[PDB]
Ligand binder design. Structure first.
Ligand SMILES: [Mg+2]
Ligand SMILES: [Zn+2]
Ligand SMILES: [Zn+2]
Lengths: 49, 32, 115, 184, 147, 56, 140, 262, 49, 391, 69
RNA sequence: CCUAAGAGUAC
């Protein structure tokens, strides 16, 4: 019934939690608050795999 | 049943799920 | 850890007695009897048989805490009738009824053929 | 599930039919000689599809096939459902109960509960005591808690026989009375 | 705790003779307060108790899947076919006097989990013990006999 | 804040709470083990020389 | 010990309300038209129908002999003679209000353990009713 | 003269009877005494010599403690608390031995029929585990893979169900009175009709149904209790009832003895 | 064990007081469990597949 | 320990179990349950500290709090429900149970009260027995809605010289309320007498409830056929009114209320209609519920539950709101991929027309999960922020 | 793990009815309820004792013994 | 022994 998917590090069963992140190479445009001089910001987290 | 092309019922959808869990499992994402 | 031994529910401890009687100062001719290592099984039976008495004015029992197996029974009888005498008569009646019931049950069981 | 036009019946219907279900059942029964019909066979024949959240923005999904695919004296005890008044479906849900996770698939009748209670049970079924593994006798774990007599639930879901819950239960069926008996 | 977020600790433990009993001699393994039901609205607890009663009486498994066509009325009718009150209420008798309870008790099997939080692992007392080396104050934690 | 305004103190206990309808409002049930660990210093006085001796 | 009040009433209405053992009856005196009664009665222990004649008496004590409660209630021994032996339904209560309904009419309120009674009539025959405990005795 | 009894069903493990002309308190006291006050024999000490099984030592000890043992002559045995021996002797205990070995390639089922009495019973009728099924094998105590061994010795003392439920000889005791609710001791919960929604008890055939117009009988007390006692197997169910009556009478006589001697 | 092996973690502070990332988003339908999350600081930030 | 009533001086009672045991009435100031709560105990180590602990921080002295010049402790949970059931006019107690209940009162003077009914059978009412616990010399007069000097509904409260003249005893009388029995007793006879009253009332009511019984079940959440049909009719009527409003808005015929946009006015109208629908269906269900309904009895006593709980369990869960608004369009212009674009119907934007008894459809379940998630997040943020603010 | 000896609620011995139950299910092709009624389990306490049991010992017996004689 | 991290318990 043991399903695996974990590592044995120093005899201890360690599991790697799925780390959530913002997707790369996508254009996202965000409105900004009144105090900021910039009103809209269009950003891409450009990354080559 | 007799008609191979007959529409499936809601119960039959639990067969497909079973098939899925027969090939993937529960920790298929980690292993893959 | 803090769990008391189960036999403390029915075994009398060292330095304590089954019955202790204290006169009640609230009403005349009234006593309070503390029964140790007893529970509702005896309390309800004794209370009902005491209430069957015609000269008993008050009869009640209470188990002050389910943790401890003991109960207090208050008996108040008419003038000239000792509450201890009322308890004696109630216990005697209970014994007589139980003996009659045992005899009747034996006689009825002896009539069976499929047992 | 993939839904096609199905010009023979003239209405939207699932691409999966009773023949594919029969082949899947035959494979499952043989596991307990014919060509193996696994999940990959459905994937490679255009029967089932993988849709992510981006593609899911551009599809319309039927919650159940029996009540939404066919075009339109009811039980008063049943919950009120809607037909959505539309027939342009592209995909169909395999089963709604598959939106729940491993911990939530253990809850009996989660739709009859208030959602914070479901969250409490999900966070609390991991603290439940049972059999974590069958080889606990050969494992030197730091702490292990095992039930003497684990019992499979009387109220069991269809999704909990994929989680091996009936094989490794984490609770007991106790006779419960809901009463103000003694004030304790 | 049940599978519906009904957590609770054991208040008192009564023996079988003190527990309320049905006309068939069945006594509950657990007695839970009614007041946990209305505010928390764990109707699924009651439905699963009724379904488990029916499943135990009939031997079939109770299908407690979320979005199926299993209604309370059907379970109640199945229970009524088995000779019990359809809503799960049973006439119970007080264990101390044997008299009938004026109110009938919701009675039936329910799936309970034992949680990891036992009282023996949480009881802790300290009159005088080890002190911190720097601040000369009692140490932290019940594993160190702390304060 | 961690050692002067609030500090760890002795003669203290902590445990789970359960309800008791048979206790008074001002009465708290204390486990026997906790009562055995927590202690109070009673000054030896002619009025209570006897009972204290028994406890000793 | 003597009867503070006595009359004959006809029941015009029986109101069960939300109760299965207690009903509130309204009755009109068959002799004096200014006397009316509202009374909670255990119908389970004393059934009452509409248009029923009830003899109603209010007394200070049940003993036949004049007075020479502060003494605990005792179960009735065999051979005990009391006014209650002549009636069907006996209650014991306290008077908690005396209201001036009009120039002649006064109303007396009684509470028998929560069973409420209101007796309204001219003060010429309700003057014996005073603020104390009383027994209500009813016969059919 | 007194409490009358009429018994409907007589079985080896059940007795169903009617208890008439008796008080409610007496019937409840008899039921409670049967549940918790009847002395019985059960395993109370377990010495484990070899345990290569997959079950914990105290797990097997707990299972053994729940094995019903014959207790017909349990009154001839003495409690271990009031015996002059050091720990256990032949006047207050029965010694059994469970010795099993897995010499079969298949699973070897260790039952209670392999519990062998070692102590000399002195002619009493106690000690034997109660066998009920037609196969002859008792309660399944353990299972052995090939090469697994389980050797242990059990000391069985007498005890009442109050100290531990493993000494309870009464199983479930059905106790009902006033099936027609003529005493109005219950207020039936209902949605539409209380008569239709509440199934009639089987005992309703034994009492006259109400006339639906008769006034409530406020003088009626509680009598005619329908009681079904079940026997685990330690003692016959008729002996269960007789010994319950005996123990209740003993308790009342002890109250009298204390009152007279003080 | 099954829940831990299918656990996803969002690395957004945890002591922040803006509740939007912790909300059950509509796009979470069928991808993460609607009701399986710690009640403490990790509410919504820790998700289960 | 947010306030001084969360840190009070008790008297030790040594018990043979591993848990602290405290009265049910004192749990309200402590904000304590028994689902795993841990509590702390400190012992004074000198006579001065012991004496000031007994004379300043004692539980009876904290009965009336300076926080709201009203009692902080009261009759709660089972003792409340029982005290409502015991003080009903239907509740008559026979001689044996009367004697037991009188003995269960520790300070009972030893006189058996004259029965409320003497012939043809001596019966005491519950009010008479409960009046024994009330100390002599206490007068309380509270007039509820519509009560007269005669009490046809047995509401209100009149106690004269320690005897309950009339009124069903419930949360307003023995609860933590200003002008109630607790306040009057502690301001007339003293805190010790008030604590003794707590004990006596708890003992007598708990004994009566033990020998009477109280439960709750699935049948208590079930309304009969005609009421269910009327609830469905109310829901359908509300949905039809929402559809009419949607037709008016989509035809631009809708006019914006001053101070908000057209969309906000439409949302306000739709939410108001759905909320009043849920309220009306719940009121229909609650009126349908008989006096023997257990949830109804608990709500009437005030021990636990509310009208909204009955409405959600029997009639309709209602409208799920996130951040004070209906379910937002997480997907492009739609809440879920199971609905078409630009669907502003109640079911699309999170209206749960099904009750908990009937179960929830998958979309309704997901929307309810979103609402509960918001509730949990709000609770955590609120407790953290309140701790900071209090410090 | 292994079939409990006695029903938790009432105390009826159910540990001697496990192999008979499995034989009835396998050899006689009965359903669960009829087998439970055949074994004499009439109260649903005993019925849930026998019906809901998970025989984990069969799993534990698959591993080779830690100490083999 | 210290530090850090993680998992939870009750609000
Ligand atoms: Mg809590
Ligand atoms: Zn010996
Ligand atoms: Zn059983």
């Amino acid at each position: 019934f043991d399903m695996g998917g974990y590592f044995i590090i120093n005899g201890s069963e360690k599991v790697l939690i799925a780390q959530e992140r913002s997707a790369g190479n996508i254009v996202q445009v965000f409105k900004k608050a009144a105090p900021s001089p910039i009103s809209h910001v269009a950003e891409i987290r450009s990354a080559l795999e | 049943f007799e008609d191979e092309s007959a529409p499936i019922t809601a119960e039959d959808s639990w067969a497909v799920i079973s098939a899925f869990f027969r090939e993937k499992g529960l920790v298929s994402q980690q292993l893959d | 850890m803090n769990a008391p031994d189960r036999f403390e529910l029915f075994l009398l401890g060292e330095g304590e007695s089954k019955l202790k009687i204290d006169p009640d100062t609230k009403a005349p001719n009234a006593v309070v009897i503390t029964f140790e290592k007893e529970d509702h099984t005896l309390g309800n039976l004794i209370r009902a048989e005491l209430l069957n008495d015609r000269k008993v004015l008050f009869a009640a029992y209470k188990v002050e805490h389910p943790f401890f197996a003991r109960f207090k029974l208050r008996i108040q009888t008419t003038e000239g009738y000792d509450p201890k005498d009322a308890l004696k008569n109630a216990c005697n009646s209970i014994i007589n009824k139980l003996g009659a019931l045992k005899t009747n049950f034996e006689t009825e069981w002896n009539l069976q053929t499929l047992a | 599930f993939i839904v096609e036009d199905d010009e023979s019946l003239g209405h939207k219907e699932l691409k999966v039919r009773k023949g594919h279900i029969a082949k899947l059942m035959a494979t499952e029964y043989q596991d307990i000689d014919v060509e193996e019909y696994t999940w990959s066979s459905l994937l490679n024949e255009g029967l089932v599809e993988y849709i992510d959240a981006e593609e899911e923005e551009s599809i319309l999904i039927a919650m159940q096939p029996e009540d939404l695919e066919p075009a339109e004296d009811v039980d008063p005890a049943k919950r009120i459902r809607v037909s959505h008044h539309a027939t342009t479906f592209t995909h169909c849900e395999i089963h709604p109960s598959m939106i729940l996770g491993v911990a939530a698939s253990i809850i009996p009748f989660p739709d009859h509960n208030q959602s914070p209670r479901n969250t409490y049970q999900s966070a609390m079924g991991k603290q439940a005591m049972g059999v974590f593994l069958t080889n606990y006798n050969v494992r030197m774990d730091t702490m292990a808690n095992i039930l003497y007599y684990p019992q499979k639930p009387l109220g069991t879901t269809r999704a909990m026989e994929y989680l091996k819950f009936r094989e490794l239960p984490a609770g007991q069926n106790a006779i419960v009375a809901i009463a103000c008996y003694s004030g304790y | 705790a049940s599978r519906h977020g009904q957590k609770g600790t054991i208040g008192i433990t009564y023996r079988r003779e003190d527990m309320p009993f049905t006309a068939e001699g069945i006594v509950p393994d657990l007695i839970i307060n009614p007041h946990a039901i209305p505010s928390r609205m764990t109707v699924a607890h009651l439905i699963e108790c009724l379904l488990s009663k029916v499943a135990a009486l009939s031997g079939n498994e109770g299908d407690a899947s979320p979005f199926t066509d299993i209604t309370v009325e059907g379970i109640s009718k199945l229970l009524r076919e088995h000779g019990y009150q359809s809503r799960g209420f049973e006439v119970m008798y007080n264990g101390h006097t044997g008299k009938k309870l004026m109110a009938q008790i919701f009675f039936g099997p329910t799936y309970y989990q034992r949680l990891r939080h036992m009282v023996d692992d949480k009881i802790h007392a300290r009159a005088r013990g080890p002190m911190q080396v720097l601040t000369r104050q009692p140490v932290e934690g019940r594993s160190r006999d702390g304060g | 804040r961690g050692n002067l305004m609030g500090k760890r103190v002795d003669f203290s206990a902590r445990t789970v709470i359960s309800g008791d309808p048979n206790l008074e409002l001002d009465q708290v049930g204390v486990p026997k083990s906790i009562a055995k660990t927590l202690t109070y210093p009673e000054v030896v006085t002619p009025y209570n020389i006897d009972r204290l001796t028994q406890l000793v | 010990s003597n009867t503070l009040f006595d009359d004959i009433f006809q029941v015009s209405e029986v109101d069960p309300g939300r109760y299965n053992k207690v009903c509130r009856i309204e009755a009109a005196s068959t002799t004096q038209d200014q006397c009316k009664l509202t009374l909670d009665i255990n119908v389970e222990l004393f059934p009452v129908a509409a248009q029923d004649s009830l003899t109603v008496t209010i007394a200070s004590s049940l003993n036949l002999e004049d007075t020479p409660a502060t003494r605990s209630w005792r179960p009735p021994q065999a051979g005990d003679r009391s006014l209650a032996d002549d009636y069907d339904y006996v209650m014991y209560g306290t008077a908690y209000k005396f209201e001036e309904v009009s120039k002649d009419l006064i109303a007396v309120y009684y509470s028998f353990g929560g069973l409420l009674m209101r007796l309204e009539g001219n003060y010429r025959n309700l003057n014996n009713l005073k603020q104390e405990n009383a027994y209500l005795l009813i016969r059919r | 003269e007194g409490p009358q009894v009429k018994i409907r069903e007589a079985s080896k493990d059940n007795v169903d009877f009617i208890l008439s002309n008796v008080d409610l308190a007496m019937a409840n006291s008899l039921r409670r005494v049967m549940i918790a006050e009847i002395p019985t024999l059960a395993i109370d000490s377990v010495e484990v010599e070899t345990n290569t099984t997959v079950l914990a030592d105290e797990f097997i000890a707990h299972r053994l403690g729940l094995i019903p043992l014959q207790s017909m002559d349990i009154e001839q045995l003495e409690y271990s608390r009031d015996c002059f021996c050091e720990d256990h002797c032949d006047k207050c205990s029965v010694v059994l031995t469970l010795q099993a070995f897995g010499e079969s390639e298949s699973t070897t089922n260790v039952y209670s029929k392999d519990l062998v009495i070692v102590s000399n019973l002195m002619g009493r009728n106690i000690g034997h585990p109660i066998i009920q099924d037609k196969e002859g094998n008792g309660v399944l105590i353990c299972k052995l893979r090939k090469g697994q061994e389980l050797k242990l010795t059990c000391v069985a003392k007498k005890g009442i169900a109050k100290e531990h439920a493993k000494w309870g000889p009464a199983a479930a005791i059905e106790f009902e009175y006033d099936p027609w609710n003529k005493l109005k001791h219950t207020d039936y919960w209902y949605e539409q009709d209380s008569a239709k929604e509440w199934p009639q008890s089987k005992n309703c055939e034994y009492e006259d149904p109400p006339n639906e117009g008769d006034p409530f009988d406020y003088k009626a007390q509680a009598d005619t209790f329908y009681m079904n006692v079940e026997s685990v197997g330690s003692i016959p169910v008729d002996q269960v009832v007789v010994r319950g009556i005996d123990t209740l009478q003993k308790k009342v006589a002890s109250i009298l003895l204390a009152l007279t001697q003080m | 064990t099954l829940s831990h092996l299918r656990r996803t973690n969002t690395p957004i502070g945890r002591d922040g007081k803006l509740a939007k990332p912790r909300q059950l988003h509509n796009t979470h339908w069928g991808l993460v469990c609607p009701a399986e999350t710690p009640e403490g600081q990790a509410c919504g930030l820790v998700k289960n597949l | 320990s947010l306030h001084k009533m969360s840190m009070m001086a008790h008297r030790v009672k040594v018990i043979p179990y591993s848990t602290f045991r405290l009265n049910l009435s004192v749990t309200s100031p402590y904000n304590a349950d028994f689902d795993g709560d841990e509590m702390n105990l400190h012992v004074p180590q000198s006579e001065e500290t012991r004496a000031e602990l007994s004379q300043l921080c004692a539980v009876p002295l904290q009965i009336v709090s300076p926080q709201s010049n009203k009692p902080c402790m009261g009759i709660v949970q089972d003792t409340l429900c029982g005290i409502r059931k015991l003080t009903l006019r239907d509740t008559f107690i026979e001689l044996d149970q009367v004697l037991n209940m009188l003995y269960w009162v520790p300070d009972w003077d030893g006189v058996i009260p004259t029965p409320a009914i003497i012939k043809p059978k001596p019966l005491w009412s519950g009010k008479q027995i409960l009046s024994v616990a009330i100390p002599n010399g206490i007068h309380l007069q509270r007039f509820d809605e519509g009560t007269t000097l005669l009490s046809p509904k047995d509401n209100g409260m009149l106690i004269i010289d320690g005897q309950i003249i009339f009124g069903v005893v419930e949360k307003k009388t023995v609860g933590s309320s200003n002008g109630g029995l607790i306040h009057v007793v502690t301001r007339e006879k003293g805190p010790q007498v008030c604590a003794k009253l707590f004990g006596n009332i708890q003992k007598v009511v708990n004994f009566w409830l033990l020998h009477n019984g109280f439960s709750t079940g699935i049948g208590d959440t079930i309304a009969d056929g005609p009421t269910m049909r009327e609830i469905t009719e109310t829901i359908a009527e509300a949905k039809k009114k929402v559809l009419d409003v949607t037709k008016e808005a989509q035809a631009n015929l809708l006019t914006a209320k001053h101070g908000m946009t057209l969309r906000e006015s439409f949302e306000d109208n739709v939410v108001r209609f759905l909320n009043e629908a849920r309220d009306k269906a719940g009121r229909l269900a609650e009126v349908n519920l008989k006096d023997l309904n257990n949830v109804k009895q608990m709500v009437m006593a005030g021990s636990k539950g509310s009208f909204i709980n009955i409405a959600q369990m029997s009639a309709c869960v209602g409208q799920q709101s996130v951040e004070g608004k209906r379910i937002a369009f997480g997907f492009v212009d739609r809440t879920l991929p199971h609905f078409s674009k630009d669907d502003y119907s109640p079911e699309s934007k999170g209206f749960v027309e099904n009750s908990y008894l009937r179960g929830l459809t998958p979309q309704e379940f997901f929307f309810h999960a979103m609402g509960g998630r918001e509730g949990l997040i709000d609770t955590a943020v609120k407790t953290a922020e309140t701790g900071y603010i209090q410090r | 793990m292994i079939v409990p000896v006695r029903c938790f609620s009432c105390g009826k011995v159910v540990g001697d009815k496990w192999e008979s139950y499995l034989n009835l299910l396998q050899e006689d092709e009965l359903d669960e309820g009829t087998a439970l009624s055949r074994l004499g389990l009439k109260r649903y306490c005993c019925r849930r004792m026998i019906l809901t049991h998970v025989d984990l010992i069969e799993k534990f017996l698959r591993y080779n013994p830690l100490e083999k004689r």
